[PDB]
Design an enzyme around this catalytic site. Structure first.
Site, PDB file in Angstrom:
ATOM      1  N   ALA A 123       0.357  30.941 -14.359  1.00  0.00           N
ATOM      2  CA  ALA A 123      -0.360  29.749 -14.636  1.00  0.00           C
ATOM      3  C   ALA A 123      -1.869  30.099 -14.601  1.00  0.00           C
ATOM      4  O   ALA A 123      -2.363  30.965 -13.894  1.00  0.00           O
ATOM      5  CB  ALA A 123      -0.117  28.979 -13.671  1.00  0.00           C
ATOM      6  N   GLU A 140      -0.317  37.378 -13.045  1.00  0.00           N
ATOM      7  CA  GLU A 140       0.120  36.221 -12.347  1.00  0.00           C
ATOM      8  C   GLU A 140      -1.074  35.270 -12.205  1.00  0.00           C
ATOM      9  O   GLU A 140      -2.159  35.516 -12.787  1.00  0.00           O
ATOM     10  CB  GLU A 140       0.593  36.457 -10.914  1.00  0.00           C
ATOM     11  CG  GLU A 140       1.919  35.970 -10.728  1.00  0.00           C
ATOM     12  CD  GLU A 140       2.143  34.830 -10.608  1.00  0.00           C
ATOM     13  OE1 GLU A 140       3.320  34.425 -10.024  1.00  0.00           O
ATOM     14  OE2 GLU A 140       1.349  33.807 -10.312  1.00  0.00           O
ATOM     15  N   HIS A 141      -1.120  34.185 -11.653  1.00  0.00           N
ATOM     16  CA  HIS A 141      -2.035  32.877 -11.624  1.00  0.00           C
ATOM     17  C   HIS A 141      -3.487  33.469 -11.362  1.00  0.00           C
ATOM     18  O   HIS A 141      -3.772  34.148 -10.753  1.00  0.00           O
ATOM     19  CB  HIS A 141      -1.545  31.882 -10.372  1.00  0.00           C
ATOM     20  CG  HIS A 141      -1.969  32.441  -9.053  1.00  0.00           C
ATOM     21  ND1 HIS A 141      -3.131  32.316  -8.296  1.00  0.00           N
ATOM     22  CD2 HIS A 141      -1.052  33.080  -8.077  1.00  0.00           C
ATOM     23  CE1 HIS A 141      -2.830  32.685  -7.182  1.00  0.00           C
ATOM     24  NE2 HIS A 141      -1.724  33.381  -6.979  1.00  0.00           N
ATOM     25  N   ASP A 142      -4.384  32.732 -12.529  1.00  0.00           N
ATOM     26  CA  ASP A 142      -5.787  32.701 -12.140  1.00  0.00           C
ATOM     27  C   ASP A 142      -6.497  34.115 -12.525  1.00  0.00           C
ATOM     28  O   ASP A 142      -7.629  34.310 -12.361  1.00  0.00           O
ATOM     29  CB  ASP A 142      -6.159  32.146 -10.958  1.00  0.00           C
ATOM     30  CG  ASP A 142      -5.524  30.914 -10.368  1.00  0.00           C
ATOM     31  OD1 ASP A 142      -5.649  30.027 -11.245  1.00  0.00           O
ATOM     32  OD2 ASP A 142      -5.195  30.819  -9.341  1.00  0.00           O
ATOM     33  N   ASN A 160      -5.313  35.899  -9.020  1.00  0.00           N
ATOM     34  CA  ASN A 160      -6.829  36.140  -8.776  1.00  0.00           C
ATOM     35  C   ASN A 160      -7.306  37.754  -8.950  1.00  0.00           C
ATOM     36  O   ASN A 160      -7.924  38.305  -7.927  1.00  0.00           O
ATOM     37  CB  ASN A 160      -7.180  35.814  -7.580  1.00  0.00           C
ATOM     38  CG  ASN A 160      -6.830  34.306  -7.348  1.00  0.00           C
ATOM     39  OD1 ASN A 160      -7.601  33.526  -8.051  1.00  0.00           O
ATOM     40  ND2 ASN A 160      -6.289  33.851  -6.437  1.00  0.00           N
TER      41      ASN A 160
END
Ligand SMILES: [Cl-]
Lengths: 216, 216, 216
Positions: A123, A140-142, A160
């Site tokens: 995402a 992975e996310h962000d 992150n």
């Protein structure tokens, strides 16, 4: 009418051609357009795994206004040089993904990515120019991935993480998540070795190996 | 008419039986043929996970000219002994793959392979007798795998690697690519430990562990 | 009529929401029921990736007798606290899996698991309360996983492993198989670090890292 190609007929290209066929034949539903290899090692055309393979001079000569190219050369300096040539010659960069490539919500990926089978882009990810995500890799996310980044197979890029331009992440490397306040940065042109376990920021141009990762 | 079996009803077999059912019911479209377990620990027939399980004496006694067996025993010395017995008894070795097993172009695999879910066999690969590719393993471009080779889950076998007969590659091991001029060799009967990061040739009969891999 | 939710709208939740949509829209064939985020950081409702997101007070206030919640918070102490609250408020815990999640024979999983894409749960596995199996993880034959266990992506949990309650297994960790006579135990609340290569029992509350795994 359209013509497709995979630029590079060595290991990278030959393992991406089936993926480019999934993208074209199934995800785009195109059983009409031809797909070939481009490789500048070639003088005369040959066949590679049952596909016509030609040099770039010959590919340019094809009388079609609508050419689409996936650059399947892992070396990101070569990839950028070819991408700039293609765009200048009015040829489109072409993103390919497999039938088993999973893309989640609010993902932005610039044209010309090679997204292999079993890849996950999770995402709220942003990815720059001609990304290579080899088999089983995830982002992975962000995360924010820059331009001409290259993942070997089975890279675990947790959330992150900010990977700057031209970084290379080797087979099975694992990278600790950042936080929203402090994204974990992999610097420009850094090389993360096969199997490296990265728990801290990697400086630009650094080469890191081992568990835990250290300068080589 | 045909009869199928998975030889070994222990962990290897019980995690391959669903794969053998994908191969038989979906990829071969066969909803008619029976599939059983063979295990020589058995005296009387039993059921294992809802399948009839019998010893080899009983399986031989079945009045069917057309028997197909996947050997689901990870120990390659046992696997070779059983394969030679089956062939001598006029029983066919049977390759199984899952619905998510990806096979690319110009791949040659000898009969009797166990190719688990999420396995990739990439371009221009050659594989010998009764290969085991456990869950998530890959074999990348231009590799040559010999006879009775065994991969644990999540093996990353990169391109231009030659793995000689009876080698064992442990869970999550990563092997550096060779080059066309110098394939990276894993010697006959070598053991590469779980998590090993292999960057050089492994001698025949060597046991290697660690990051980077060293003799144990 | 029914209402679904993903509890947690941070990285865990945002990477599970697409999975919860696969579970609901495809595996349950439900194109009618609404799905939202719950996050207690919220005062006023907002949208997250195109889904309504509200706090638990607001979710409780919804006039529907039939609520189903996936808890997408990786911290297992928080997850248990929320699960106990939900059950006390008469809300159902909801297992989610992806279209590429593989479940084999004779598997038992308690309600409320988050089973990501590319996860395998192999033969004869038992799993307790609100298990998290992040992307690409596997649990192989004969394992017993307790309550509120958490796997990061790409955990390789081999056969005959017993993981006690509230353990955490980090990204890409590999755990050696046990035997039927001696299952390999990961103790209650143990933490296995990213990339750890676990070859022996991990004590309760231990933190282990490295290849091979050692106390941190
Ligand atoms: Cl994987």
């Amino acid at each position: 009418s359209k013509v497709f190609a995979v630029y590079g007929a060595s290991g990278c290209g030959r393992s991406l051609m089936p993926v480019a066929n999934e993208q074209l034949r199934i995800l785009e539903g195109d059983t009409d357009s031809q797909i070939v290899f481009i490789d500048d090692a070639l003088d005369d055309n040959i066949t590679v795994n049952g596909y016509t393979a030609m040099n770039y001079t010959k590919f340019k000569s094809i009388k079609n206004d609508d050419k689409f190219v996936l650059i399947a050369i892992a070396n990101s300096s070569i990839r950028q040089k070819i991408a700039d040539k293609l765009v200048k010659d009015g040829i489109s960069l072409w993103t390919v993904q497999g039938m088993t490539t999973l893309i989640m919500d609010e993902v932005s990926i610039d044209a010309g990515a090679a997204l292999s089978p079993f890849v996950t882009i999770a995402a709220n990810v942003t990815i720059g120019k001609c990304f290579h995500a080899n088999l089983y890799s995830y982002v992975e996310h962000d995360c924010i991935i820059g331009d001409y980044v290259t993942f070997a197979p089975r890279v675990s890029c947790n959330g992150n993480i900010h990977i700057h331009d031209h970084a290379y992440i080797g087979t099975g490397a694992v990278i600790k998540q950042g936080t929203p306040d402090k994204p974990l940065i992999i610097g420009k042109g850094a090389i993360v070795g096969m199997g490296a376990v990265v728990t801290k920021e990697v400086p630009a141009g650094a080469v890191v190996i081992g568990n835990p990762a250290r300068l080589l």
